[PDB]
Amino acid sequence: SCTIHKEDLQDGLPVLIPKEDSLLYAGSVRTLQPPDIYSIVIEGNRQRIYSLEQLLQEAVLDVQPQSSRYLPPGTRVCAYWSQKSRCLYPGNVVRGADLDSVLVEFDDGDTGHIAVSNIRLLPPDF
């Protein structure tokens, strides 16, 4: 469920990583010669080196759903809020009153419709 396993940490793996602002950013895993440390190219693009353990705890797979079919109300997601920002905001899909958009209530208190292409899945207990 988008939770990362050690075996999958390979060069080019697409991930989302939290920064010190409680928001998520899309990144890519770059393996290094030493085992169990990785550089994450974080979207300009800058890098930060992570241990294996910190990646397992903090990062999630970057997974874009194809449609709203399996994003019913209650589904945990994050989302691009604007084209002008590369941060993703965590929240949950909520029931409105559409195969290509969902209504999301964000942890920060905002609510808005999000195009499915701007949704990324999250682990339920993230």
């Binding site: 602002d21 928001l23 809020w81 604007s82 002008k84 920002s85 941060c87 905001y89 920060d108 905002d110 808005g112």
Partner: peptide, 6 residues
């Protein structure tokens, strides 16, 4: 971190 307004 300011956020775009809707």
């Amino acid at each position: 971190h300011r956020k775009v307004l809707r």
